[PDB]
Write a protein that binds this ligand. Structure first.
Ligand SMILES: O=C(Nc1cc(Br)c(O)c(Br)c1)c1ccccc1
Ligand SMILES: O=C(Nc1cc(Br)c(O)c(Br)c1)c1ccccc1
Lengths: 115, 114, 115, 114
């Protein structure tokens, strides 16, 4: 129920091998690690979680943009891109978090569907 | 009543000395030259027109993004960026057309205020 | 070799039933109609052209954003979103033109791959 | 040396009276409050800090987008927008953090100049 897609606005390509870490806010207000992975050759990261495990909560999707750009030999501006949202509060939904990256800018959008 | 602002998402800077052409749609559906200039050191192009001249109608703002990228030694995707909109007297009176450029992407927004 | 995808930033959804018209610059510098179609329920428009037909040239992809928003009962700013680019000039490539729409703003990106 | 500008892509306007909090990363990796304010009628928040106070380091700019949308009667997706970056004295001296808001999307860019 959660997929992350990342594109590169400089190359006109998927952003491959981007590390993504997902956190969930705990009862004590700290960010607990929830799932992590890397984008594939298509710029997509599938299989982060399951419908059982992806319960209601406040989630943070951290896209490690600095690590991506530095691995390409570029010095970018941001440390990462964070996307923070409440999920599943009216029941289970499927979420796609999409991001488009440039060295000094990024855009993110969500596509939320009811299966 | 019309200002154009252009930013560069690669370098994190204004996009300086970018050519911008404005056209007005004529009765026969052709695009007639209306105003033009180059962005300043702040990425902004002021003074394109006046209230008297900027009547309701369809306008197109063409931003020469290809020359901009090539002067920086970068191969870009688009021939230019285009922004086509209707000026409407029932809305606010000042229009800022902003664009944010990357080699393979651009975004544009309108900020319309009184 | 040419696909168009459109998303809606207000709804967090694919932009369904968006009309798209593609033009190709002719020898006399006019825009000749090349292909057209509508986005599906996924926000994707497939099947615009063929590798035989999609020769080198300067193409314009016009995404009819005003018609989309008006069909939803909203008064938007732009008439359409245009994407103008040279295609296939180093041989055949596959192009995805993606757009993200809001009533007063849009973003577009290209993903260009070599098959 | 730091200004924050917020725009609304739905209404085509500055995003006015949006709360913005700036934090500096402390030695123990916690986020310490640094400066805050609300955007003006132009969507801009000036005067957050001074050159003396704005030393190199990692900063986070948190924009309260959820309250902004709810005050307009619109249900938004994000809890807030975050922008996390390093201030570097080897680059230009003035930073503008700009954000463009939609209910289910946002974009941000840095404009860094001397
Ligand atoms: O989210 C965007 N693109 C995008 C999103 C998804 Br989902 C997708 O499968 C593909 Br192909 C492209 C986008 C972001 C900014 C500007 C234009 C598109
Ligand atoms: O329209 C944008 N930025 C912008 C727009 C204006 Br008018 C301005 O004075 C500054 Br400084 C920045 C924008 C576009 C994409 C992502 C973030 C901001």
């Amino acid at each position: 129920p959660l997929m992350v897609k990342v594109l590169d606005a400089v190359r006109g390509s998927p952003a491959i091998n981007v590390a993504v870490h997902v956190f969930r806010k705990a009862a004590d207000d700290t960010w607990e690690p929830f799932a992590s992975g890397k984008t594939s050759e298509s710029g997509e990261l599938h299989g982060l979680t399951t419908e059982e495990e992806f319960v209601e909560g406040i989630y943070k999707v951290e896209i490690d943009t600095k690590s991506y750009w530095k691995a390409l030999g570029i010095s970018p501006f941001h440390e990462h891109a964070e996307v923070v949202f409440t999920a599943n509060d009216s029941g289970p939904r499927r979420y796609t978090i999409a991001a488009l990256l440039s060295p000094y800018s990024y855009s993110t959008t969500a596509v939320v569907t009811n299966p």
